[PDB]
Design a protein around this ligand. Structure first.
Ligand code: MN
Ligand code: MN
Ligand code: MN
Ligand code: MN
Ligand code: MN
Ligand code: MN
Ligand code: MN
Ligand code: MN
Ligand code: MN
Ligand code: MN
Lengths: 377, 377, 377, 377, 377
């Protein structure tokens, strides 16, 4: 049918030409809760509303501060690689965090002591590359599609420092002096970047491992998130990776949240920093409570980026018939949340009652244990 | 069918959960022209991706710098009023420009000399309220739906100065002293804003006209845009209103552009300032050329806001089977464009040939007359 | 007695050490109107809360953006000169406006065509020196005390460009070359600024007038404000000087307002720009209405600076037994106000009634004529 | 008597209407030391010059960057609670530090692991609530009045996140799903914030202590400052609390300083960060030395906020007949000072003599031991 | 001869008046490598292009953000002292790092616990004074000339806080109270700063050492850089001092690099922060690779400051017949580099080959060991 912005005796039919498909995706924006109030920044953007850079070997598209200006500290790229295809050896100022949604890939990184780490990453695995350390990605036989997160909102994937670009803009006589070779021996260097390029599938990981005189890296740059024991609650699961468990991940803390149909990520906030969200699958709504009587509700589905500024109250409700799966990302060395339920459970019952104008029948339901994902009764 | 981000031997299928409806709306973003290059800011946002404020009597939703950060100087509200419903007497810092898409409404404004202007506005008519001058809107028997544009991108419709809000936050003894009445005579003043409220249809315009000792306003605050003679070219029509014809409209210049199926707003730029766009109906693509080899293509349809930063090259192509109708808005005292075709037509033919590596067969087609909208052969 | 922050059943006694004298000056801040709400910037500062620069010949103290940060565009100096004393020949980037509160002074200015203007200024007279044009002040037999206003809030009177300071920091050989004299002939130049210095009373104005080959200045740099016919209303008087009457005063518009005991500057706003206020004498309160249900009330008395950001609603009530006299200053080429009373008087009565939930008994009192200062009945 | 801005042969009488009460409070501003020079930002503001928010149960007023713009990193609230009255359960982005000037109060806080801390705070005690952790205050039988300090100068007490405000702006169906209750069971939730509200006195602290499955908090959130041994010197006492002793107080370091009549906080600076000051009781002057020959003297008394930008030289002299009691606050993990006396005492005597053009009779008085508060002989 | 901006068939002779001496110093700017491209900020400035402050006892000149705006975080002073001359006891907000190029000097510093450190510094030695800690420099019998680096680009040596300046701007009665002396005993204090002043040579270091009750400083404030074992490679030497070895040097990391004729600082970048450079002796060129196909080459010689923004690729080639000696400075707690050669050596050879379109003959030359300075074959 044709939705209309009408809630009881408020609102009216749309009389001008309109985008009905978007309206159907955003039922809680066309018709917000009556409890929403006030001006709140946009907290929602779709990767489908971005330009996709297509190359021989894959694609990349990005949601940055230029698309979602509330997110000044975090930006993201959705990158796809065909089997064997290579994301060119490169580096950047920003630290990089990744979640492998589809397929698998081999990564390399060499640190500032000349120690190398090469590893394969499958579905549900992470990587983290510290700022400035050079790296590569090469998809294996399934190809690969993954979400990258960078710890500056001004990032662009089009502005990384790439190996062949560096060399193409260095005098040939300097390259030749650098390596002790002749100009003639390097005459076939590419004249411009490769960025993403097709290539034959690599061999087994064990045959690629490079030995060196500087030893093994002290901490691995990949993490098997979905192999960890999640926090399990009645309506779903939460898998957390931050610097306390994924040791190298100093500037990005993360959680993968799964919310069953009929369940919700409970009312909570984060006492440390802003939340950046990516919706892997399913359909959600979230109200962001911004203080001073301000609140705004947003809809999300697969391919959407979301955001919750530092300490704002929120929940994430599954509003569809399939599991809702999303990431909570933070530019910090740890994950932290405060649960509304747990907070109140840990206070004297008559003090809570004095605040809420409710009785023992309400305070009796509170739980001293935190259940990040709750199920409707 | 299911579109894929593939262009010849570049790109790949999407392997993760995705937004197919948005992808179908954005064919030139999922699969951009091969001539696009480089990082360009987002220049596209949909009103359907905003929270709609619903009231008894209508609604309002807004696209501001918080949604579309490239647009720092201009923001917009899509407002709807039911028959008789009133947008409360109010004022703001920003100048306001309006286009009546549907229905009709009566406006009031009183200037700083106490001169009043009251008028009815129908489909295709404009208004402009200078900064700080107080005004109202009341829909007539059809209701009304219109686009407002404000000359600061940080504007919000939730932060206007409203008559009843002012009074509700003034001491009653001061209001009483101000008007020479008792506190008891003003005890029924509202305790909070009305903003939008239902009301009986007004009488005929002629019975509302208020006489006063300060004379008539020197210039009218409404303009009948579609009653003017348009610039007519082969593929469509352009109706311009700026301060040279709509005399009061000092900070906003505007054009309504209609592009027939198979036609396009020609390659041009604006030598004065940024363009802000609203797509009333139809489907378009535009490439924005940002210098230094940068260009990015965007798709638009009804309900979308677009933008072209100052002097960037562009065209707007109708990519659908119905007329494409959009507005070009500028924060300036005049409308100006430079046509690529006309520019080259006015130069020596061999000089143009020396630039383009093309011959007389090309320079022979150039036209010294500007045709803002051209039709495909 | 000892005031307490108590309003009915709200508030409590002060239990900590406190400033009772300030509390008595600020009755509407210790106990605000119940109609105040929300966070509003400070709009009030006293010259008595500033450092006074004392010199042989007078003093100067200043209220700038460093004291009152809401006032980014306007700053002010209270300057005093003893009989004959000279404020050293100087210039600055900012335009300067002045009001002579006490005494009289002779000013000089020479423009960029070498035309000079020399004039005496008495109580109630103004001057205005355009940006960058050099000038001096010399008090006559009564001395002089005056208020200066500069059109940048970052100004300091300690950073003007002074004649002797310039010369003290120019090589002597360059000064000598500049004027065609020897170094020995300029050996007695001061080694540092004078700034303010004692001097013998000048002769009659007519004997100082300097003739030159470049003609008379086209417009005078002084204005006799109190010799003009004021707008007279029931509770007081308003004398306006802006660029329409005081022709040179391009960046500062001004009004001197006198409010009798029992009267008030009516409910109004300014549709052009921010108001900066100086309270010459008496005692006032003002509520500033900042939109979105925000309002805050401030107290003022002699020596206080006030402020009203662009378009905010306000009134100024005399709360004492003597006349209240203050200045309204604007960084603009004209003075403009919108009267609440006049605005509503110029609208259809049933439309006003529909907004205010009041009847004909209220709309019957409205006046189509603007009375800037009204008297309580 | 009537003070005048005259120092020897400099300055003059005030000839315009003036604020004599403020002038009497500011003797060193109306008549500064001759050693003051140059433009220095205002470093002084009174809580009496702020709007007091009155509620059933108490009040709150604030000095922020909007009042004192030099203080960009720290803001403060003076809050008062009647017996039993509650400052509503809330949280904010900023860390909060407190000093209990009058009375006593019970605080709660629950951390991000669901561990609760509940404690009573009396006169001279502190609390510190880390950023984002939720908390409450409830005055006991004497009521309470206290100073709060927040580690962002842009803070407002009107913009905290409050429990009932959050719930009033969350859909009822979501609250009901969150807790596993019906909408009918939560129908009596408040429709707006409480902020401060009257309530019956609580029971004994021991009966409120809440046990839980997550253990005790590792570090307490209150500190008994006046129970510590102070640094005692000849003219007074200094009690320091920073993160080395009050372990949780990571972003605020503090000292309570008492200066006897005839004594002074010695010439010193802080090598770490800016000082923010609150004057609890008595009367002071301070000269701030800002380098490059700049210095400005300010007066302070009970209710005043002061400031000393990072590393600027200063002293605080008691200029009254009662003890001077003030706080020195720093946004840092430690308190540090450099004493002028100690610095010079620790250098070779002839090196100091070469700088000061003074002899052994001066360097003989220097002390290698730091005495923060010295007494006049 | 007369160089011309001609490279093969590109460029042309200079036809206007020109600076031939500068052109000869900048051969790679008048005629850049053909591999340079795009707009890059200036990364080069000479101390000879600054005003030199001359005093009795020496001089000082500075390169700050006002000269080299890319360097926002670091500024530098070239200071010279004659034998015995003293840089006056002073402090500042910034941390200070120093390299002694010529001669020797005695430094003092007293920390916030009153512990003093006094030491002599010779050629190739460093000092580091933490933020806010007071210090002095006194040249010994050879005089001294040294480079200072401050960890804010906005620093000026003319704005330090100086002992005598502080006292000259403090009331005499306060100084007298501070020390327990009479005003008469301090009447000979200087009336203004000394800054730099002549003085007799000090005695032996051992006779200056001051004992005190607060113990020895835990870490020394000087470091003998050239007494350390350098990293030695084929074309030169690198001596690194950062917080891991020069323990107090928390905010500045440093390397002294010596590059023999025919050698070069290899292709590398820094993964941590920006590089600031000072060229002690010799002649260099460097290409800075700025990503996105941007690169610009600069020339440097003795007296020049250089810069490399965070993570940009670069090399430093000796282009003269004498050793090239320069400093690499970083605002960080450690030095880190990534070598292009080592990076590629630590990857699988066929992966490198796939990137570079080169064969085993190239990957066979790569070295797993980092050689910061390489020599041409
Ligand atoms: Mn990367
Ligand atoms: Mn969350
Ligand atoms: Mn409006
Ligand atoms: Mn256009
Ligand atoms: Mn002046
Ligand atoms: Mn006004
Ligand atoms: Mn709090
Ligand atoms: Mn201090
Ligand atoms: Mn120094
Ligand atoms: Mn380097």
């Amino acid at each position: 049918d044709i939705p209309q912005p009408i809630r009881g005796d408020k609102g009216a039919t749309v009389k001008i030409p309109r985008n009905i498909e978007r309206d159907r995706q955003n039922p809680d924006m066309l018709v917000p809760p009556e409890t929403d109030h006030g001006t709140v920044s946009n907290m929602k953007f779709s990767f489908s509303d971005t330009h996709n850079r297509l190359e021989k070997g894959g694609y990349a598209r990005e949601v940055t501060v230029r698309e979602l200006p509330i997110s000044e500290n975090l930006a993201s790229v959705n990158m796809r690689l065909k089997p064997g295809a290579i994301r060119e050896l490169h580096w950047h100022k920003e630290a990089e965090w990744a979640y492998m949604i589809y397929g698998s890939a081999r990564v390399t990184i060499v640190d500032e002591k000349g120690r190398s780490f090469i590893d394969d990453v499958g579905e549900g695995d992470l990587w983290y590359f510290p700022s400035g350390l050079p790296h590569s990605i090469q998809a294996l036989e399934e190809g690969a599609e993954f979400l990258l997160v960078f710890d500056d909102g001004s990032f662009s994937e089009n502005s990384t420092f790439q190996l062949t670009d560096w060399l193409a803009h260095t005098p040939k006589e300097v390259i030749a002096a650098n390596f002790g070779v002749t100009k003639e021996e390097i005459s076939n260097l590419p004249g411009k970047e490769k960025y993403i390029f097709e290539n034959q599938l690599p061999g087994s990981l064990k045959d690629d491992i490079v030995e060196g005189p500087n030893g093994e890296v002290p901490y691995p740059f990949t993490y098997r998130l979905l192999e960890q024991e999640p926090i399990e609650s009645e309506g779903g699961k939460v898998y957390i990776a931050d610097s306390t468990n994924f040791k190298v991940s100093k500037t990005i803390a993360s959680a993968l949240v799964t919310v069953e149909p009929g369940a919700m990520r409970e009312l909570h906030w984060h006492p440390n920093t802003h939340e950046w969200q990516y919706y892997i699958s399913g359909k959600a709504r979230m109200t962001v409570f911004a203080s001073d009587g301000h609140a705004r509700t947003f809809n999300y589905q697969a391919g959407d980026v979301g955001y919750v500024p530092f300490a704002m109250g929120h929940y994430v409700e599954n509003i569809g018939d399939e599991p809702l799966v999303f990431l909570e990302i933070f530019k910090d060395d740890h994950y932290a949340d405060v649960s509304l339920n747990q907070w109140l459970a840990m206070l004297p019952e008559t003090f809570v009652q004095a605040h809420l104008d409710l009785g023992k029948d309400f305070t009796d339901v509170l739980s001293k244990e935190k259940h990040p994902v709750v199920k409707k009764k």
